[PDB]
Structure formats: structure tokens, C-alpha cells
Amino acid sequence: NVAHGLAWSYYIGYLRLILPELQARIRTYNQHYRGAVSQRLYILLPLDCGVPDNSMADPNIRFLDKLPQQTGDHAGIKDRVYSNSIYELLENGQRAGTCVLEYATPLQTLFAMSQYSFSREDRLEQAKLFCRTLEDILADAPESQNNCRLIAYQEPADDSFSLSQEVLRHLRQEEKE
Amino acid sequence: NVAHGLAWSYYIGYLRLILPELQARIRTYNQHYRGAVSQRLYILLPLDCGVPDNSMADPNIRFLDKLPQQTGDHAGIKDRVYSNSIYELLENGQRAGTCVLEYATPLQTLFAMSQYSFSREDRLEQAKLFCRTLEDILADAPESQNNCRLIAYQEPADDSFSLSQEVLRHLRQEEKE
Numbered sequence: 068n069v070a071h072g073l074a075w076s077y078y079i080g081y082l083r084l085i086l087p088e089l090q091a092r093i094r095t096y097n098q099h100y101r102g103a104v105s106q107r108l109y110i111l112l113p114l115d116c117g118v119p120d121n122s123m124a125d126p127n128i129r130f131l132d133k134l135p136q137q138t139g140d141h142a143g144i145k146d147r148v149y150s151n152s153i154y155e156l157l158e159n160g161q162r163a164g165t166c167v168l169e170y171a172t173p174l175q176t177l178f179a180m181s182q183y184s185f186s187r188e189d190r191l192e193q194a195k196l197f198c199r200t201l202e203d204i205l206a207d208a209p210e211s212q213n214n215c216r217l218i219a220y221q222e223p224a225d226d227s228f229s230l231s232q233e234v235l236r237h238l239r240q241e242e243k244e
Numbered sequence: 245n246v247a248h249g250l251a252w253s254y255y256i257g258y259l260r261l262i263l264p265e266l267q268a269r270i271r272t273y274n275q276h277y278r279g280a281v282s283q284r285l286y287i288l289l290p291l292d293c294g295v296p297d298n299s300m301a302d303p304n305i306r307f308l309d310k311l312p313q314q315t316g317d318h319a320g321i322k323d324r325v326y327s328n329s330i331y332e333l334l335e336n337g338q339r340a341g342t343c344v345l346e347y348a349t350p351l352q353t354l355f356a357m358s359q360y361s362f363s364r365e366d367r368l369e370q371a372k373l374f375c376r377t378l379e380d381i382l383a384d385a386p387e388s389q390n391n392c393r394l395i396a397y398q399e400p401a402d403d404s405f406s407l408s409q410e411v412l413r414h415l416r417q418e419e420k421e
């Protein structure tokens with residue numbers, strides 16, 4: 068599968084290097100800036116493989132601040148910085164949650180291969196495989212340990228579903244556990 | 245192929261976003277720091293799929309400075325910084341060249357899938373496919389325009405081949421053209 072290898076390498080290429088030190092960067096911010104970060108990387112997995120080159124497309128999901136940068140030497144890039152963004156989530160207009168939110172960038176490729184002049188059905192199937200594979204990796208992975216959540220979703224249409232309520236729901240079971 | 249999709253997404257995920265503005269960042273450095281950058285991203289493609297989590301493994305390939313950082317909003321990461329490193333290349337002990345050098349990170353996954361308890365033969369075949377595919381993309385790509393070189397190589401052994409001479413050779417045809 069293309070999606071099988073896109074999921075492995077997203078783990079070996081990004082997650083296995085940022086998740087180990089993610090929660091420590093979160094504590095650093097939460098000390099110097101109940102409206103706090105959920106100590107976990109919430110990966111938006113748009114099943115439509117629609118990832119933006121710009122999360123504000125769904126209101127109530129608003130950017131707040133950037134997480135302290137992690138610099139690590141990688142593949143010849145000295146102090147390769149790993150940047151991550153913290154977003155506020157709003158319910159009824161008020162801040163009901165703050166978390167580190169970002170799209171799975173590999174799903175973007177499944178899109179370009181299906182955006183037409185693969186099939187839109189193959190995209191759904193392989194996006195699902197990517198989610199199912201990456202979730203199985205992150206289950207057996209030793210670096211993924213109460214630090215990552217895979218938010219798979221599919222807005223049937225723009226005038227439709229509230230990701231804010233979808234991600235906030237995950238934020239509540241966090242606090243409940 | 246896994247390597248077919250690893251090459252596409254390395255393009256759609258990194259190259260197509262950094263190569264457009266790469267040469268401009270190079271001019272900025274070359275103005276404020278004949279021993280200058282070759283205006284192109286030289287991607288080391290270790291056919292052994294051996295990419296380091298640390299290029300100084302081969303002497304005469306030495307780090308000099310970091311390229312001015314490119315900040316761009318990507319997949320929810322605000323000001324996602326794209327960092328790239330400039331390396332000096334030495335011949336007979338003197339600086340014969342300076343260039344932006346970095347390993348292809350996707351080859352690292354082909355390694356973990358072949359590092360054993362895939363096959364080491366499948367790794368060579370798929371590393372080759374990754375190189376051949378990524379070179380065909382970067383040929384038809386509009387963002388890859390006298391800005392990228394794919395340095396495929398295979399050191400038969402440690403006590404062996406000088407990448408310095410291999411990359412410098414590419415640096416000379418640059419100056420010769």
C-alpha cells in the first residue's frame with residue numbers, strides 16, 4: 068500500500084522524534100503562559116485527505132500560541148526545529164479547551180494522487196488504511212504513550228458537524244481520565 | 245510501491261514547499277556571510293537507506309552555518325519553520341566548496357522495514373525506485389528548476405569512496421555551467 072508506507076514513515080520521520088519530548092514542551096508553556104493544554108498531540112485526520120496549506124476553516128478552532136520549539140539534529144539538518152501550534156477550542160463562544168492540533172501531512176499526498184484532471188473511493192480506503200495503520204503503530208510504539216490522539220473525521224459538506232465539538236469531546240475524556 | 249509513495253509525498257510534503265524559496269534564502273546568506281553556496285539543495289540519497297539521526301560521518305564534509313530559516317504556515321502549524329544546513333566540502337584539506345546538504349529522510353523508513361531481527365535486496369531496489377521516482381517528479385516539477393540535485397551513492401564499506409569528491413564533482417559542473 069502507498070498509505071501503509073506513508074503511515075510508517077510519518078511515524079519514523081516525525082512522530083517518533085517529536086512525541087518523546089512533546090509533553091515536556093507542553094509543561095514548559097503551561098508554566099509560563101482549566102484552559103490548559105491536554106498534554107497530547109491531537110492529529111487531525113481528514114478522511115477526505117483534505118489538509119490545508121494554511122485549522123481556522125472550522126470556526127471555534129482558533130490559534131492561540133506556538134509551543135516552545137524543539138531543536139534536534141536530523142539527517143544533516145543541524146538544530147532541525149520541530150514547531151507545533153497550540154489551538155483554543157470554543158463551545159458557546161467561550162474557551163472550553165486548549166490543545167496542540169495539527170493535520171496529518173501525509174494525507175495531503177493521497178489527495179494530489181486522487182484530485183483528478185487514484186479514485187476518490189481509493190482515497191477514502193487508503194486514508195482509512197493510513198489511520199488504521201498509524202494507529203496500530205502508535206499502539207505498539209514505545210514513544211506513543213498517552214501523548215497522541217488520531218482525530219479521524221469526514222465533514223460531509225461545508226454547510227454541515229463541529230470539529231470543535233469533536234476535538235473537545237476527546238478533551239473531556241482526557242480530563243475524565 | 246511503498247517507495248513510489250514515499251517519493252511523491254517527500255515532494256508534496258517538503259520539496260515543493262522549500263525549493264521555491266530556497267535559492268532566495270541562499271542569496272541572503274551569501275550576501276552577509278568562490279567558497280559560496282551552489283544555489284541548489286543537494287539531497288544525499290544513501291542507497292543503503294542509511295540516513296543519520298545526527299553528514300560528518302564522512303570527513304571533509306563539515307558543517308559551516310545554518311541557512312536563514314523559512315517560516316510558512318503548514319497543516320495547522322503556524323510559522324512552520326523549514327531549516328536547512330550549509331556544509332563545507334574540503335579537498336586536500338582546503339575548502340573547495342560550500343553547499344546546502346541534507347539526507348533524504350524517507351529512505352530512513354525503507355531501512356527500518358529492512359533492518360532485520362522487507363529484504364536488504366528489496367531495500368536497494370526500492371531505494372533505487374525512490375531515487376528514480378523522485379528524480380522524475382523533480383524533472384516535470386515546476387518548483388524544481390536548477391535548484392535540486394539528487395546525490396545517490398553506496399559506500400561499499402566504511403574503510404572504502406569520498407562523498408566529498410562525489411558532491412564536489414557535482415559542484416564543479418555547477419560552476420562549469
Ligand SMILES: COc1cc2[se]c(C(=O)CCC(=O)O)cc2cc1OCCCOc1cc2cc(C(=O)CCC(=O)O)[se]c2cc1OC
Binds near residue numbers: 073080142253
Ligand atoms: C520521511 O517520511 C516522512 C517524514 C516526515 Se517529517 C513531517 C513534519 O514535519 C510534519 C509537517 C510537515 O510534513 O511539513 C512529516 C513527515 C512525513 C513523512 O511521511 C512519509 C512519506 C515521505 O514523504 C514526506 C517526507 C517529508 C520530509 C520532511 C522534512 O522536513 C525533511 C526532514 C525530515 O523528514 O525531518 Se516533511 C515530509 C512529508 C512527507 O509526506 C507528507
